[PDB]
Amino acid sequence: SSGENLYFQGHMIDFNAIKNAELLVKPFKVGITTNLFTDPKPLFKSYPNSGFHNIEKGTEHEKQYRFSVREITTSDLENDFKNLGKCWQILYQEVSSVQYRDAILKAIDLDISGLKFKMGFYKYYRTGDWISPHKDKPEKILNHVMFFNETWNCANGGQFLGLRSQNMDDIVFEVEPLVGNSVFFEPRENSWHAVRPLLCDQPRLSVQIEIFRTQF
Ligand SMILES: N[C@@H]1[C@@H](O)[C@@H](C(=O)O)O[C@@H]2[C@@H]1O[C@@H](n1ccc(=O)[nH]c1=O)[C@@H]2OP(=O)(O)O
Numbered sequence: 001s002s003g004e005n006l007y008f009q010g011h012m013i014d015f016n017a018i019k020n021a022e023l024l025v026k027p028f029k030v031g032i033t034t035n036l037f038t039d040p041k042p043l044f045k046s047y048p049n050s051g052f053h054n055i056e057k058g059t060e061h062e063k064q065y066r067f068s069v070r071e072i073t074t075s076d077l078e079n080d081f082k083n084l085g086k087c088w089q090i091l092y093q094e095v096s097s098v099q100y101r102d103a104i105l106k107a108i109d110l111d112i113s114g115l116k117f118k119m120g121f122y123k124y125y126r127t128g129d130w131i132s133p134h135k136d137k138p139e140k141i142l143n144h145v146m147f148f149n150e151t152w153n154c155a156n157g158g159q160f161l162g163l164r165s166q167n168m169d170d171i172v173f174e175v176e177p178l179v180g181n182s183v184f185f186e187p188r189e190n191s192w193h194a195v196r197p198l199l200c201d202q203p204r205l206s207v208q209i210e211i212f213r214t215q216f
């Protein structure tokens with residue numbers, strides 16, 4: 001039994017998990033967290049279940065993918081996030097805080113002060129949902145992908161793949177989509193990555209934060 005006392009929990013995000021992320025510089029500069037969230041367990045159940053749009057692109061497009069997305073919009077800002085769980089309003093407030101800017105600056109020596117961001121729920125949940133090898137758009141100065149699954153059968157597919165080239169097989173590292181894990185990097189001419197296609201209809205739940213100066 002635990003003690004009859006308080007315990008410290010400064011924020012939804014453990015900013016020290018960003019400052020002290022695993023940091024690669026080759027193949028490209030990318031941070032990988034563990035235990036990003038101070039209270040991870042309830043986040044899976046609170047992830048939104050409606051409001052998504054399915055989207056796909058095939059070989060006609062410069063990247064291929066199949067997934068569903070629900071963006072945070074100005075409508076959510078104006079209605080005090082009434083259509084989302086309270087934890088997503090808190091996440092938005094923390095991403096928009098000086099603390100997040102300070103953590104990123106310490107981790108990767110990039111200053112995001114005064115930049116803009118988008119924030120969206122990206123759900124992969126049908127067999128074959130994936131995204132093909134891509135760098136991210138160069139208009140993006142930083143991308144931070146956060147995962148929310150409480151459990152994940154690795155044999156399901158769905159790993160984030162860090163790649164050495166535009167080739168699904170040229171894998172340098174993998175990240176499992178488990179709550180607390182996240183990946184943040186500046187898009188560059190060689191920041192190749194992908195998501196291994198799902199082999200099962202199992203929901204793989206993420207949020208992407210996209211930071212930029214020029215709208216895209
Ligand atoms: N966020 C990722 C990221 O991969 C990014 C990049 O390339 O950095 O491209 C983004 C991609 O999701 C696509 N998407 C789809 C529906 C929507 O509402 N918003 C949205 O962003 C778009 O892909 P496109 O169709 O090639 O433009």
Ligand SMILES: [Cl-]
Nearest residue numbers: 212213214215
């Ligand atoms: Cl500008």
Ligand SMILES: [V+3]
Nearest residue numbers: 134135136193
């Ligand atoms: V990407």
